[PDB]
Paper text:
Here we investigated the aminopeptidase, P. aeruginosa aminopeptidase (PaAP) from P. aeruginosa, which is highly abundant in the biofilm matrix. PaAP is associated with biofilm development and contributes to nutrient recycling. We confirmed that post-translational processing was required for activation and PaAP is a promiscuous aminopeptidase acting on unstructured regions of peptides and proteins. PaAP contains an M28 Zn peptidase domain (residues 44–116 and 274–510) and a PA domain (residues 117–273).
As a result, we truncated the C-terminus (residues 513–531) by incorporating a C-terminal thrombin cleavage site. This allowed the selective and efficient removal of the C-terminus during purification to produce PaAP_T (a C-terminal truncated form of PaAP). We solved the structure of the truncated enzyme form lacking the final C-terminal residues, PaAP_T, to 2.35 Å, which revealed a large conformational change. Superimposition of the peptidase domains of full-length PaAP and PaAP_T demonstrates the different orientations adopted by the PA domain due to the removal of the C-terminus. The PA domain undergoes an ~40° rotational transition in comparison to the full-length PaAP (20 Å translation at its furthest point). The conformational change increases the opening between the PA and peptidase domain, causing the active site to be more accessible. The rotational swing occurs from the base of the two extended β strands that project from the peptidase domain (starting at P161 and E272). Interestingly, the modified C-terminus (thrombin cleavage site, LVPR) is fully traceable in the PaAP_T structure and binds to the PA domain of an adjacent protomer, where the C-terminus interacts directly with R189A. The interaction of the C-terminus with an adjacent PA domain aids crystal packing, the protomers are linked together, akin to a chain. PaAP_T was highly active in comparison to full-length PaAP (an increase of ~100-fold in kcat, while KM remained unchanged), suggesting the C-terminus is involved in suppressing PaAP activity, in agreement with previous studies.
Author numbering: 48 to 516
Write the structure that this text describes.
Amino acid sequence: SPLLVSTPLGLPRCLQASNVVKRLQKLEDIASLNDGNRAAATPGYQASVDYVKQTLQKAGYKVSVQPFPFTAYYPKGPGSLSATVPQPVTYEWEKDFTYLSQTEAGDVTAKVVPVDLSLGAGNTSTSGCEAEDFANFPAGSIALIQRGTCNFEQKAENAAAAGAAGVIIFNQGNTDDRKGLENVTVGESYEGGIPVIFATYDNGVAWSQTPDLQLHLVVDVVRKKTETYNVVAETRRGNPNNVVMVGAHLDSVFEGPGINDNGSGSAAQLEMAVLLAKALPVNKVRFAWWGAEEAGLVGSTHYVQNLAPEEKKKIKAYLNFDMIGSPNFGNFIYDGDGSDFGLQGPPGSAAIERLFEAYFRLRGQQSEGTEIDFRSDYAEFFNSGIAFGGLFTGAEGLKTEEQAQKYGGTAGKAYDECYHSKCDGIANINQDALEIHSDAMAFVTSWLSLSTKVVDDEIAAAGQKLVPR
Ligand SMILES: [Zn+2]
Ligand SMILES: [Zn+2]
Ligand SMILES: [Zn+2]
Ligand SMILES: [Zn+2]
């Protein structure tokens, strides 16, 4: 009924936790038929996107499925490295060598060719940074390259273009702290097609001075360059130049179904969008289900960074819902005004946080602020100066005794002991939390859909933009 759903009085009371739990069960079912997870570049994520899209269309929405590039990478087992010629030597995983993250897999046995080495203390090597560092590089060989100056990606792609079958990069050795193994990457953009490993400085030097040497290199990973998706919809009704946007990431980590993280935000937001289908908002409401958040906020950052300036200034507020059903929950509100932790968001954030506070106070419920640690999809909105806020029931942090007496649960335990785990299933969901944070989501969204004036007022106060007539 439009009577109810168009107001902060009607929307929370018609968004029912039992319906949200139904959608959560659907998400867990999606994960159980898709190898146990709903992660980026998996079938579980694709089914999740389809379930959201088809639900949204069934309610009358036009749905935009925004693709963006995504490189799936993970190691499958330890590497191997062996000298076959001049003499047999088996090197030691994570002591003599390690992978470059984002390497391709491979199994290569080849003569080793050092490339433009500049050894010794104080060196400023450019090994493999330029193209004719590979002058007369015999194709098929393993390129032996020293760290220095340019990105590892550039060195390895130069080696591949020069016909290397594999790349070994050893630490620079210009200081004594730069000779061991390190956590290194060839980047998400890397397109050399050949495997890349990292070795200690002393191994690199020994290899560079061994005539005839042949290395047997094995790199056991999966890597696929592919794409994943944001799902976006918005009300047909409402002012398109004063958009209220809400977002919840739809992907899980690889290790589990991600029903609290973040089925909970996704499902509550979907239920709300369905109810809002018949609403009559003053302000347009936009809903986004973000892809690849667990890989580093990739979908939300893509979406924001690719908006036309005219389009970004139509977004008056962004509301983020990421983990709102934690088993040992607290009632956490983004500290948009910096009152608790010193960092406040763009102007209007204070008003959104006070709206959330108001709702909790009127439910007779305790609440407190939580850090803007940039660990969810509001980040790119913050970087663009868009007013934002959101709700959170806690992750790997431990519940204090003060919090236990405000919110129940168990002090000294994690808010979500199944954070990023296989057990983050439908049974990890605390329904009290889910109901109150769903209601709070509904309350603040509806209020903003009727008047943005508590956000506009702080935008104006901070803005300096003086009207002369
Ligand atoms: Zn060079
Ligand atoms: Zn999350
Ligand atoms: Zn997460
Ligand atoms: Zn605050």
